Write a protein that binds this ligand. Structure first.
Ligand SMILES: [Zn+2]
Lengths: 32, 37, 96, 94, 108, 310, 91, 75, 116, 80, 76, 79
């Protein structure tokens, strides 16, 4: 079970990671 | 017994979702009450 | 908006934990008796049997409409046309 | 005629899992229905395996197969587990 | 009438330019051939030999059709790297008497 | 204002590109180049198409993985004219293989190569543009395992989430949801007997209609909620599917009273003990919460101890 | 001890066994069949009822209702599969 | 009774006199379903696809009753 | 009977097992008279491209296989009266040849031509 | 009043709206009745089939239950 | 028969591996599988063509197969 | 990776057999996927019936049950 859950979770983690990057980036560049 | 795999995904999520509901209503009221002009 | 039409119908979505039968029970019960009669006389219908049929059919027809919607959607159509029902039935293979 | 049901044991089990909780007759009826449905699904499949052997008698062995065939993943793991425990629990005498 | 060898040409301006077969449909009627195009590039209207690839032809206009590394241009000039892979009727080309030998080894 | 072509610079480029929608009556190929402040797509027939980088609401890149085309999807903040029509969505793509077969390793391998070749070339173009753009145009890649079957317009397609949008760019017309604009989500028709359900999107500007995503299969119910959860998206379920146009004008006309009635809490299926309506609209059905009477238990003694062979 | 109580089970093993014997599932039936079966029933029953009581809590209720069973089966990926085409009747 | 007509778009009519031959191909509904082939004396060919095994026998009985030439009749 | 003779002279091809010669569409339509119950080359064109070959040389008219020399030299004495090719080039897949072998059907190539 | 219309267009319109179906051709409503009748006919036949073994001349929910099973429409909420 | 028996058998033994090693199959089973396999794909394509027809097209697409299986209830 | 071994023409020939006129290259990716899903369930069931029979090599008897159990039943055999 864990392999596909990890594959799905991974896609979710990547999304979360990319969202955070974008979140941090969006605020910083507009803040400048 | 106690064969359940883990807490249901909803139960975990519920707190955040319930949280989001509170956040949403506050958020919605300002944005919308402000937008009403 | 606190006014009627808003409150009840809005909340009825949440009040509707109920499973109200969508076909009118008596109008349907008469049809059951009718089709029952079409088969054979002397058939007492227990309301339970009437309910059993009614609930199954409603969900079942909704089921048929699930497929029919797909098939309309399939054909890039919103309005279902009998061809969709037919398509659905043919594909399901649920034909007499 | 005298009515037959499992609702009694369903409630006992409900209490065994949620003593603190009770249940309505309609939900009870559903659970009682489920007991009847799943019992026959397995009862039929256990019969076919015995029938494939061309034999007169059904055993827990047919059940393990039918359970794994009918029950999905976790349910098969646990049904194998809980079922093996339950078999063993009334095996220790003899 | 069979594929897979290295051959010599007979007709047209496409006289005797050696080629090979690239990929095969089972019908054994024609042979695909690794060839050099003889086009004018559709320019006398608004004969030659030069390998050409689908690119200056796109400035004159005409059919630019890519199938990836496999191409089609200006009226099915089936071409790749500027070479035709058009098939010829196996009788219309002189196929026999080549037989890749020890001296021959490098062309295709 | 302009575009400003990045003259005498190694302007990244892609050439196997079919624009969508077509400029003229029929499709054309062309190549896309990144310039000082925007892109340009130039057709093989000499037509010039320009896209300021800022005017791109989103740049989303669909690799040809499992798709007969590799696509760069542009969702725009404003619609732009293709002469024939104006579009807020644009695409650049190319065919991966034989789409019209009429009823092998080299061909199959060439597919693997050609895909990788294109896939790389595009991936390179993106990186070159991201670098050129000071990353201001990160190409969101739809997280395919996070996609699900649905219909935002008329036909069934695989909807896929991206870092900031939910989209389906394979089909046309293109479907793009900027999650920044999602006020709330409602899972209409959710019920146990159904096999599919629907999703409604509420926008932050209520003057604009909700969007449905009809017949999504119920097997995706929990995964979609989780995705929504991870996006900080509030969602709600409802077996019913009441009129949103009414609900919008209702709340548009009286948001004050709406919020006072708990606002959006109106969608809550009253799962857990919200004190405001702690008892919801509930009543006992018609039962004495199944309690087996004392006399019903007595027949158990005939469970006769016959040690029937193991 | 009742066969059920030998197994400590709530489920009437004699009923499960009796159902099979008179139910034409076979010419004969060995004790291991109803024994295993009765245990499986309580297991899945508990599996569901466990979710049901949880759902009842998740419904502000100490009283379980059919409405709660719908949430359990669709949220449980296994019951969702085991009860994929099943119909629940309620007025 | 004296021809075949395909109703609605594209509307097409056939007369048994215009038929050269026809056949009930192994169809598209079941391994025993059928599709109907028609070629006219004009060399123009028409074919009707996707028809149930059930309608195979009736059309089979019908065309023999119309005595028209079926490609597989020599089987 | 004459149903085995080219109905039309356009795109003639020879069966590759028994060398019977018929039109592209006659094989597609009718199959081989001596090998359809053994070959099943009937009704399809990819199959046609595989089994029926355009590369055949000369034609032989079978009149009396029971009392004839050509009937022998061409390996056709066991066939029914028809027109066959003197030599057809090509070869069958590595499966049907075994299926044929299993039935006691020995695939011998009709390729009478000498190679250079 | 004729019960075939008893499955009124609005009764149908409700079901189709629930099956997610949006616009509905008039034509549909009619076929729905046929389908429903076909559906019911198969079911009722089976209910009678069961009723005959039971030597009954009364139709019970059990017969319907035992029937819906046989059609892949297993129903919960009836019996003891 | 339309698939190469080797790749087919290779796949059968390969997926068998994911469930359990040691597993191999007598010819009768693998043939029976292919016999079943072909029937399923045949039915599905016919059905898919019905969709093709229904969608007013002749070029079938995965979505046609998806819908057919979707309506067929092949999935969970 | 033997699913890639299920040749496009093999699939293509079945599609022609199913009366399909035309196909889009994605059908192969899709067809392979479909073939796996069907196979996965049939073999898992075939495996389980064989596992019950206490054997490690599957027989036609076992596959008949796996298909029959799924309603995908085979024809032409008896015993
Ligand atoms: Zn022959």
């Amino acid at each position: 079970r864990d392999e596909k859950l990890d594959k799905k979770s991974q896609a979710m983690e990547e999304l979360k990671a990319e969202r955070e990057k974008r979140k941090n980036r969006t605020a910083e560049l507009l803040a400048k | 017994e106690r064969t359940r795999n883990e807490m249901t995904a909803e139960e975990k999520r519920r707190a955040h979702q319930k949280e989001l509901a509170a956040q949403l209503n506050e958020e919605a009221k300002r944005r919308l009450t402000e937008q009403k002009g | 908006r606190y006014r009627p039409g808003t409150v009840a119908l809005r909340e009825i979505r949440r009040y509707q934990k109920s499973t109200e039968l969508l076909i009118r029970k008596l109008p349907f019960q008469r049809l059951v008796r009718e089709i029952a009669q079409d088969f054979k006389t002397d058939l007492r219908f227990q309301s339970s049997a009437v309910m059993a049929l009614q609930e199954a059919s409603e969900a079942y027809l909704v089921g048929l409409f699930e497929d029919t919607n797909l098939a309309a959607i399939h054909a890039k159509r919103v309005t279902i046309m009998p061809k969709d029902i037919q398509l659905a039935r043919r594909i399901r293979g649920e034909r007499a | 005629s005298r009515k037959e049901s499992y609702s009694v044991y369903v409630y006992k089990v409900l209490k065994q899992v949620h003593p603190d909780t009770g249940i309505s007759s309609k939900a009870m009826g559903i659970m009682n229905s489920f007991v009847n449905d799943i019992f026959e699904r397995i009862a039929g499949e256990a019969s076919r395996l015995a029938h494939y052997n061309k034999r007169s008698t059904i055993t827990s062995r047919e059940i393990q197969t039918a359970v794994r065939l009918l029950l999905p993943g976790e349910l098969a793991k646990h049904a194998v587990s809980e079922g093996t425990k339950a078999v063993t629990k009334y095996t220790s005498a003899k | 009438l069979k594929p897979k060898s290295w051959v010599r040409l007979k007709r047209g301006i496409y006289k005797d330019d050696i080629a090979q077969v690239d990929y095969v449909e089972p019908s054994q009627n024609t042979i695909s051939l690794k060839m050099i195009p003889r086009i004018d590039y559709d320019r006398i209207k608004a004969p030659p030999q030069r390998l050409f690839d689908a690119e200056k032809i796109r400035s004159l206009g005409g059919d630019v059709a890519s199938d990836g590394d496999f191409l089609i241009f200006e009226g099915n000039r089936y071409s790749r790297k500027g070479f035709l892979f058009k098939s010829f009727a196996m009788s219309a080309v002189i196929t026999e008497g080549v037989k890749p030998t020890l001296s021959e080894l490098e062309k295709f | 204002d302009s575009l400003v072509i990045n003259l005498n610079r190694s302007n990244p480029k892609l050439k196997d590109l079919y624009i969508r929608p077509n400029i003229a009556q029929k499709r054309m190929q062309g190549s896309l180049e990144a310039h000082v402040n925007g892109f340009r797509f130039t057709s093989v027939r000499g037509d010039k198409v320009d896209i300021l980088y800022n005017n791109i609401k989103h740049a989303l890149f669909q690799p040809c993985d499992g798709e007969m085309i590799i696509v760069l999807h542009f969702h725009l903040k404003n619609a732009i004219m293709f002469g024939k029509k104006r579009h807020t969505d644009v695409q650049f793509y190319t065919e991966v293989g034989e789409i019209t077969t009429d009823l092998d390793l080299y061909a199959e391998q060439m597919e693997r190569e050609m895909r990788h070749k294109l896939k790389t070339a595009f991936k390179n173009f993106i990186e070159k543009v991201e670098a050129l753009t000071k990353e201001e145009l990160e190409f969101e890649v739809p997280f395919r395992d996070l996609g699900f079957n649905g219909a935002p317009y008329r036909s069934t397609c695989l909807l896929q989430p991206t870092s900031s949008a939910l989209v389906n760019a394979t089909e046309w017309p293109p479907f793009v949801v900027t999650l920044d604009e999602v006020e709330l989500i409602h899972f209409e028709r959710v019920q146990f007997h159904l096999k599919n359900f629907d999703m409604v999107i509420v926008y932050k500007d209520y003057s604009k209609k909700v969007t449905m995503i009809n017949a999504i299969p119920v097997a995706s119910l929990d995964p979609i909620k989780e995705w929504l959860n991870s996006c900080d998206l509030k969602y709600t379920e409802g077996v019913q599917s009441l009129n949103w146009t009414k609900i919008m004008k209702t709340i548009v006309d009286d948001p004050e009273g709406f919020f006072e009635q708990g606002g959006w809490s109106f969608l809550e299926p009253e799962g857990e003990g919200s004190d405001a309506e702690e008892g919801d609209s509930e009543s006992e059905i018609e039962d004495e919460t199944f309690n087996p009477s004392e006399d019903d238990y007595e027949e158990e003694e005939e469970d006769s101890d016959e040690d029937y062979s193991s | 001890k009742t066969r059920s109580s030998r197994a400590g089970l709530q489920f009437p093993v004699g009923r499960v066994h009796r159902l099979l014997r008179k139910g034409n599932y076979s010419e004969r039936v060995g004790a291991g069949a109803p024994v295993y079966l009765a245990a499986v029933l309580e297991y899945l029953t508990a599996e569901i009822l466990e979710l049901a009581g949880n759902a009842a809590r998740d419904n502000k209720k100490t009283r379980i209702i059919p409405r709660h069973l719908q949430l359990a089966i669709r949220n449980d990926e296994e019951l969702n599969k085991l009860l994929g085409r099943v119909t629940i009747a309620q007025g | 009774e004296r021809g075949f007509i395909y109703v609605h778009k594209p509307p097409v009519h056939i007369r048994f006199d215009e038929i050269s031959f026809v056949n009930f191909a192994r169809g598209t509904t079941t391994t025993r379903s059928f599709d109907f082939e028609i070629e006219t004396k004009q060399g123009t060919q028409y074919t009707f696809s996707s028809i149930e095994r059930e309608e195979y026998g009736k059309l089979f009985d019908f065309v023999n009753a119309k005595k028209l030439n079926i490609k597989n009749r020599g089987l | 009977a004459l149903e085995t003779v080219p109905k039309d002279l356009r795109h003639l091809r020879a069966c590759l097992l028994c060398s019977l010669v018929k039109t592209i569409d006659q094989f597609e339509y009718d199959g081989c008279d001596n090998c359809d119950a053994y070959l099943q080359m009937k009704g399809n064109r990819e199959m046609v491209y595989d089994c029926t070959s355009s590369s055949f040389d000369g034609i032989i008219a079978m009149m009396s296989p029971e009392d004839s020399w050509v009937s022998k030299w061409q390996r056709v004495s066991n066939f029914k009266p028809g027109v066959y090719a003197v030599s057809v080039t090509g070869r069958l897949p590595q499966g049907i040849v075994r299926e044929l072998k299993s039935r006691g059907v020995a695939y011998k190539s009709r390729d009478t031509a000498i190679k250079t | 009043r004729d019960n075939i219309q008893g499955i009124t267009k609005p009764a149908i319109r409700r079901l189709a709206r629930r099956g997610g179906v949006k616009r509905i051709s008039g034509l549909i409503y009619e076929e729905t009745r046929g389908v429903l009748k076909v559906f019911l006919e198969n079911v009722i036949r089976d209910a009678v089939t069961y009723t005959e073994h039971a030597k009954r001349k009364t139709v019970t929910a059990m017969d319907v239950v035992y029937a819906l099973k046989r059609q892949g429409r297993t129903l919960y909420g009836f019996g003891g």
